[PDB]
Amino acid sequence: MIHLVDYALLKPYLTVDEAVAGARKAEELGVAAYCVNPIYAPVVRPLLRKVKLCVVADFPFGALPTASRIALVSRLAEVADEIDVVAPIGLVKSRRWAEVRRDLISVVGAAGGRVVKVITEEPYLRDEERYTLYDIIAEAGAHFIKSSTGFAEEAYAARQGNPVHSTPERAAAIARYIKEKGYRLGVKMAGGIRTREQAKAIVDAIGWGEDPARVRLGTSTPEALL
Amino acid sequence: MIHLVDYALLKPYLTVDEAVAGARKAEELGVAAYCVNPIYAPVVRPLLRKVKLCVVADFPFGALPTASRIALVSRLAEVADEIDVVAPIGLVKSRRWAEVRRDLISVVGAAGGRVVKVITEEPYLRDEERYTLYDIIAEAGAHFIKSSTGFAEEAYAARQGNPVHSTPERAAAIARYIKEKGYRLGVKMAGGIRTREQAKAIVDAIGWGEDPARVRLGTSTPEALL
Ligand SMILES: [Zn+2]
């Protein structure tokens, strides 16, 4: 199960030494990828060989102008293996679908070939928004739907009717939809996955077995599940 | 005192309608500036006449590589009157001063003369970091030091021995240092400023009167101020 893990150290106060130590630990554990803020991509790049270098973009708000977002992703694609970009959360809540799809198609297209995961921030969404968004993400040709940033607020999330942490039910809901629509999209759950038990539950919930190309587990405590 | 206020609506889930409402409210109140995430800059631009258009950059982590930060600030300066960019927090915690100054000097200078405020994120800093950071901010030619993003984590703050909300003690300390070093820098306290008395407390502590070019009060509840 360790090979389905995207080991994430994304706190803004993470230091160079900590980022370097993380990469080293990522390689030894054999995780699927190591995710860090863009600033540390160059220093970590040399330490990764088998494990993929994953970077977040317009994280964690997804509140940058589309023009800046495509530009950022374009640069990032020069050194990162995979890019986890936040959806335009604000525009989604505004139900500005025309703008949401214009943004995601252009942003994903800017990654030029790299594996792109769009963070939907499930804690902030309602059902009428999430499925329309999933359709847009498939339309954009993204590789994965990442459930959350790991920085969602509990208060607002609750008002939208959601828990802040990943649950097997949400994971299954996303996986069921993709499968039913026949989309070529993987599912990456993140948030509150710090025990091997919970992780296992999410994998069984998604129902695709342990396929790294279709399933990823985002966590800051990888050792805990292997 | 409302004229020293920087009315900020930065939640990623804020809607377009909410951002418009905010601009209208900003103009009615006569606050110094209205701060939003760059995505809403264009739509708010028209509703702002007397009030300055303020936008945050690489917010709230300040964890993008320098090149992207420069490009971002350059683009933002084309439509925003003021730019509140986050300092490279991770690098500051790493005490990578050579890199921190190369970054801030470059980023601030990419603003093309616009009013630039560098967010220090006081809740995450120690004395061994903040003063050297202030020196760098001055060396970079910024107009203001913004105390915090408003999204600092309570746990890490406590770990660093700092409160998350703004305090007169902190404001006075920043002011005293800039006065002693002769820096041409303003002080913008933000975060937890909920009342008129708290706001007055901060203004008195800074000791520069109600001078907008040197003192700002960032808050999401401006009405409470006056
Ligand atoms: Zn497969």
Ligand SMILES: [Zn+2]
């Ligand atoms: Zn003055």
